[PDB]
Design a protein around this nucleic acid. Structure first.
Ligand SMILES: C[C@@H]1CCO[C@H]2Cn3cc(C(=O)NCc4ccc(F)cc4F)c(=O)c(O)c3C(=O)N12
Ligand SMILES: C[C@@H]1CCO[C@H]2Cn3cc(C(=O)NCc4ccc(F)cc4F)c(=O)c(O)c3C(=O)N12
Ligand SMILES: [Mg+2]
Ligand SMILES: [Mg+2]
Ligand SMILES: [Mg+2]
Ligand SMILES: [Mg+2]
Ligand SMILES: [Zn+2]
Ligand SMILES: [Zn+2]
Lengths: 64, 47, 258, 242, 259, 47, 242, 64
DNA sequence: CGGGAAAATCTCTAGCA
DNA sequence: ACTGCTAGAGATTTTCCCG
DNA sequence: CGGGAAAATCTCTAGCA
DNA sequence: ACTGCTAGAGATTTTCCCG
C-alpha cells in the first residue's frame, strides 16, 4: 500500500536554493511536498525548502 | 526600531531616514514621511 | 578625548571610520558609530541579490521592442518555457488577449510583470480576474525582479538574429525563435530543452500532488515531540512533523507516535 | 536485477508492457523493454488534427490533440495560406507537433503552409474531431455573452474546455491528459536513446563469445545472449566497442 | 550516420551541441565541431577580465561631466591618488595644461586615457612629447581599460555630493572632494589614504632602485645552471634567481653552480 | 591559424571570421579583411 | 631584543637619534624612540611659504616647500582672495600642508582665504624662498621661448626645476627630496600613533608593580620601569587596562 | 656591506596578482626589483611577477 | 593499484529598454 | 507586504577506460 | 587547554557617459 | 601590438583576552 507510493514520491528529483546562495544545488531526493514547504533529503540531509525555491522534476534521462 | 536609507527608483541620490515597517529577503517595506514604500535590499541600508 | 576632535573632523570631511580611527586613535566601534550618524554618509545598500519566485504556476511577462515592433513575451519561471508574439501596439487589449491565450493553454496561477502601462491596464486586470490569475508587480524600476523574463528577452532576441534571414516578417522570425528555444536548445537543471522541462515540471507537480493526497488519505499518525501533531515523513532516525503550520525535523528521541 | 525470471514468467502469463513490469518489479526500463520485445506474441502522441470552423463569418482554426482532446483555437481573419502557416508555426513552437491531419483545404495545401511544415519538421496527412469541435462550439455559445469580441470568446471557451472540463477515466481535464501523454512520450524517447547508445557494445562473459549488453549498474551487468537474459558480476564481463 | 541529419537540423535551427548530441546520439566532440562551423552561432566571447597596468609611472586620465561642467581627472593607478580640476571647455589646450601641471608635480612616465577627442588633440600630443610622457589609449569604446580612473570618477562624484553644499563654485567643491579623497579616506592595500599610499609607492620605488644599484655595483656572481654565465640576482633558501638572455629564472641550489 | 569572431565597439552584432595576428592577456590583435584591429578578449571568441 | 644595553652605550657615546639606533641595532622603532626620549641631554615637513611674483603684469603664485625646495607655481588672473584661496585649496588637496608662511598681503588676509585655511585644516603665519624664486625665474626665462603663453612657461619651468634640476647631498631633485621628507613624516606619525595607543597599558612582571610597556613581540615583551628597560617572557608578564 | 642592504631590500612588502586572479594577494616580501619583473617570496614560494602587476610598498604602519 | 583523455563540474560575463 | 537570471566559454577536476 | 567578543578576512554589488 | 576597478556592507573566521 504505502510502500510503493512512498518509493515513487521519493523517486522525484528536487533542486533547491538557500536565502543567500544564488546557484541551484544538486538533485536532492524528494521526501514530501507541502503547500509552500517541501521536505527533501540531500545526501541524508533532511531539509525544508520553501516551495518558491524548489523545482521538483522526475528527470527522465536519469529515470531511464 | 531601525533607520533605513534608501534609493527609490532611477533616482541616484539616496533618501532617509525612514522607519522599517517590515523586512524580508531581497526587499524591505519602509515608511518614509508616512509614505509606505518597497525597496530592494540592494537599494537600502539598515542601521 | 578624541571623540570631539573626530566629530569636528567628520562634520567637514565626512571621513570613513577607518580614517577617523587611524588618525584619532579611536576604537573602530566608536568610529563606525560616529560615521553611522551622518545622513550624507549612507550612500550604499547591502550587497546581495534576492531570489525570484520559481513556483510551477508563475509566469513572468514583459514587452521587448525589436525593429520598431512590440514583442510581448511570457516565460515559465520554473522551466524557462517561453511564449512570444508580435503585437501591433503596446496597448492593454492586446496584452489581455495574449495573457488569456496563455492561460487557456497552460495552467497559469500568477503573473509577475513590471509596472508597464499595458500590464497595469484595467482590461488586463479584468482578464486576470476572470481566468483566476494573481497579478504580481515588481518594485518600480527594478528590472532584476523580472530577471528571468528579461534574460529571455535577450536570449530570444539573440535567436531572432540567427533566423531573421529565413523569414520575411518579424512575426514569423519571432515564432521560429520561440520554437528553436523551446525545442532545439538543451541545458538547464535537467539537461532538457525548455519544452521538455516544462512538461516534466507540470507532470511532476500533478503526480506528486496525487500521490501525496493518497498517502495522506491512507496514512495518518499523531505524534508527540519533546502536542498532538501530524506526521509527514519518517526515516533514518528522523521524523517530519506538522504542527500549527510548522514543519519540523526531529529525531526519534523526543518523538513518539500513537 | 533479481526479479528477472519473475518478470519473464509474469510477462508470459499476462503479456504486460515493459512500463508496468519495470515499475512493479523495480527493474531498469531497458531490461523490461528488451524482455517485452523478445515475446513476438506480446508485440501517436504528437499528432494533431486541424479544422477551420466558421462562426459569425469569421474563421476559427482549431487544432485538436487526438490523444487527449486538448484544444488550441485561434480566430484568423482570412482563409489564406499565410494565416494557417503562422498558426501551424505557433502550434509547433508551443507543442511538439510531428504530424498534422487536414481536410485538404485550398489553404492547407498552399506552398506557404508547405514551407512552414517543412521548416518546423512536420508531416502533413490528408471521430474525436467532431465531438471535440462541437464541444468547443457549445462552450463558445455559452461564454459569448461575456466577451466583447469573438476572439475573446474563443479564448475563454478554450480555457474552460482545457482546464475546467474534467472528464475521462481519472476525471482529468485535457491539460492533465496532454501533459501526461507528452511526459510518457519523453520517457519513451529517452529509453530509446539510451538503448541506441548502449546497443553498440559487446560483452564477453566468463571466454564466452560476444553478447548483447543491456544494462550496466554498480557491480552487476545485465546482458542478452541468445534470448537469454543473464546478470554477471562486473569482473567476469569484459566490455568492448564494436 | 546521424551526422548528416544533425547537420541539416543545425542549418535550420542553429541548435547547441547539447541538443544535437542528445537528439542524434552524437558524441559531444562532433556536436561541438559542427556547432563551431556556424558563423551565426559565435555570439559570445571569453568570460574573463584583463588587468590594467599598475606600474608606478602609470597615470590614467578621463573627463567627467558634472552640473554641465567638465571636470578633468587623473589617477595614479599604483596608489589611487587623484588630481582633478574643472575646465571650462573640453578642448585640447586645457587638457594639455592640466597634464603639464600634473607632470611637473609628480613623476608621470605614461598616461593611459580613453580615445576622447581632447586626449587625442595634437596639442596634448606635443605636451606629452615635451615632458617625456608616453601616451597610451584603450580599445575604442572599452571603458574597462580605464577602469581605475572610471571608478575614481564615481567615487569623486560621490564625494562632491557630500560637500557640494559647503561651496558655491563647482571648482571649489571639486577641490574639496579631491582633498577629502586624498587625505581623509583610508583603505587600499596598505591601510593608507591615497596620498600616503602614493608617497609610499614613490619612496619605495626610489629606495629599491638605489639599493639594487648599489648591490649590483658591489655584488657580482656568474652562475652555471644545467648552461651559460648567467647573472645572479638572488640566492639562498634553497633557490637561486639568475638572469640569462633576458630570462629571470629561479632554479634550486642543485644543478646551480656559482663562481 | 585561428578563427576569431569579435564585436568591435558599440556594435552588438558580431563579426568575423578573422585571422589572429597576435594574442595577449586581456586583448587580441586580429586581421579582418586585411584590417588590423584590437579587441578585448571579452569581445572575441577564438577557435 | 638583547641589544638594548648596546643601544644605551652607543647613544651615550654618540648621542644618536632613534632612527639610526633602530636601523643599525635592528631594534623596534618604539624602544629606540623611548630610549632617545629618556636621554634629556640627547633631546616641520608640512610647512610651505607662498609668494606672488609678478611677470608681464601677471601674478604667479609660487608655494615653496622649505624642507626640500619643491616648487608649485600657478598663474592667477588677479590678486584677489578667491584665487589665493583656490590655490591654497589645490595645494592642501595635493600635498599635506600644515602651516603656510605669507607676507601678509591684502589678498592673503581675505576672509575667503581665512575660510579656505580653516576648512582645509591649515594655520596661517606671517632664506630659501629668495633662492628658490630666483631659480624659478631663471628657468622661466630659459624656457619662455618654447611656450606661447605664460602659464605654459610657468608649468614648464616648474617641471624643469622639480624633476630635471638635481642637486643636494645625494644629487636628488626636489621631487625626491619632498617624497622622502613626507615618507619620513609618515613614519614619525605612525610611530607616534603606536606609542599613544600602547602607553595606556600597564605590565606586571615576576608581582612587581605596574611598569611602562614598550613593545609586545612573539615570545618576549619589552617594558620600561624606572628608566630601566627590561625584556620579560610573556608568561611572567600580565597586561592590564585602565 | 651587502648584508644590511639585502636585509632592508627584503623588508619591502609586495602585492601581486596573476593573469586570471583579479584580487591583489597578501604582502609577499620583496626579494629583487627588475626593469619589468620583480622576484618575490610569498611564504617561502619564490615567484616572478611582472612589474605591471606589482605594487611595492614599505608599510610604515607595519614597520613601526 | 596508475595514467589518459573525455566528461562533468566550476567560475565568470554580457545584457536584458 | 518582495526578491537577478540565463546560456555560453574556458579551466579544472573527476572518472571510466586502458594497463 | 576552552570561550567571547572584537578584529580581520571574505564575498558581493553599484556605478563609473 | 592590451588588459575592470574601487569602496562599502554584511557574513564568517580567526585570534587576543579572559578563565
Ligand atoms: C515603462 C516600463 C515600466 C517601468 O520600468 C520601465 C523601464 N524598463 C527597464 C528595463 C531595463 O532596464 N532592462 C535592462 C535591464 C537592466 C538590469 C537588469 F537586471 C535587467 C534588465 F533587463 C526593461 O527591461 C524594461 O522592460 C523596462 C520597462 O518596461 N519599463
Ligand atoms: C567620447 C569618449 C571617447 C570614446 O568613448 C566614449 C564613451 N565613454 C563611455 C564611458 C562609459 O561608458 N562609462 C561607463 C562605464 C561602463 C563600464 C565600465 F566598465 C566603466 C565605465 F566607466 C565613459 O566613461 C567615457 O568617459 C566615455 C568617453 O569618454 N568617450
Ligand atoms: Mg518591461
Ligand atoms: Mg524588459
Ligand atoms: Mg572618457
Ligand atoms: Mg569616463
Ligand atoms: Zn559624514
Ligand atoms: Zn548554427
Amino acid at each position: 500500500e504505502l510502500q510503493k507510493q512512498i518509493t515513487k514520491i521519493q523517486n522525484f528529483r528536487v533542486y533547491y536554493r538557500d536565502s543567500r546562495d544564488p546557484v541551484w544545488k544538486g538533485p536532492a531526493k524528494l521526501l514530501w511536498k507541502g503547500e509552500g514547504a517541501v521536505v527533501i533529503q540531500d545526501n541524508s540531509d533532511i531539509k525544508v525548502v520553501p516551495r518558491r525555491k524548489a523545482k521538483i522534476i522526475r528527470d527522465y534521462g536519469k529515470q531511464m | 526600531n531601525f533607520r533605513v536609507y534608501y534609493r527609490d527608483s532611477r533616482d541616484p541620490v539616496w533618501k532617509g531616514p525612514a522607519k522599517l515597517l517590515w523586512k524580508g529577503e531581497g526587499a524591505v517595506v519602509i515608511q518614509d514621511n508616512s509614505d509606505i514604500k518597497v525597496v530592494p535590499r540592494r537599494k537600502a541600508k539598515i542601521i | 578625548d578624541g571623540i570631539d576632535k573626530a566629530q569636528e573632523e567628520h562634520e567637514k570631511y565626512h571621513s570613513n571610520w577607518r580614517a577617523m580611527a587611524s588618525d584619532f586613535n579611536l576604537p573602530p566601534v566608536v568610529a563606525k558609530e560616529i560615521v553611522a550618524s551622518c545622513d550624507k554618509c549612507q550612500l550604499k545598500g547591502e550587497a546581495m541579490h534576492g531570489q525570484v519566485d520559481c513556483s510551477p504556476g508563475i509566469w513572468q511577462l514583459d514587452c521587448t521592442h525589436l525593429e520598431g515592433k512590440v514583442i510581448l513575451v511570457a516565460v515559465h519561471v520554473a522551466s524557462g518555457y517561453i511564449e512570444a508574439e508580435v503585437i501591433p501596439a503596446e496597448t492593454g487589449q492586446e496584452t489581455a488577449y495574449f495573457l488569456l491565450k496563455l492561460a487557456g493553454r497552460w495552467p497559469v496561477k500568477t503573473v509577475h510583470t513590471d509596472n508597464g502601462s499595458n500590464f497595469t491596464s484595467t482590461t488586463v486586470k479584468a482578464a486576470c480576474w476572470w481566468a483566476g490569475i494573481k497579478q504580481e508587480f515588481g518594485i518600480p524600476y527594478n528590472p532584476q525582479s523580472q530577471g528571468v523574463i528579461e534574460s529571455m528577452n535577450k536570449e530570444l532576441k539573440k535567436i531572432i538574429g540567427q533566423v531573421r534571414d529565413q523569414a520575411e516578417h518579424l512575426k514569423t522570425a519571432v515564432q521560429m525563435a520561440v520554437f528553436i528555444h523551446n525545442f532545439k536548445r538543451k541545458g538547464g537543471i535537467g539537461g532538457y530543452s525548455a519544452g521538455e522541462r516544462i512538461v516534466d515540471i507540470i507532470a511532476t507537480d500533478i503526480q506528486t500532488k496525487e500521490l501525496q493526497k493518497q498517502i495522506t488519505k491512507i496514512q495518518n499518525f499523531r505524534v508527540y515531540y519533546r502536542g498532538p501533531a501530524k506526521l509527514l515523513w519518517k526515516g533514518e532516525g528522523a521524523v517530519v512533523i506538522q504542527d500549527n503550520s510548522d514543519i519540523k525535523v526531529v529525531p526519534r528521541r523526543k518523538a513518539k507516535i500513537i
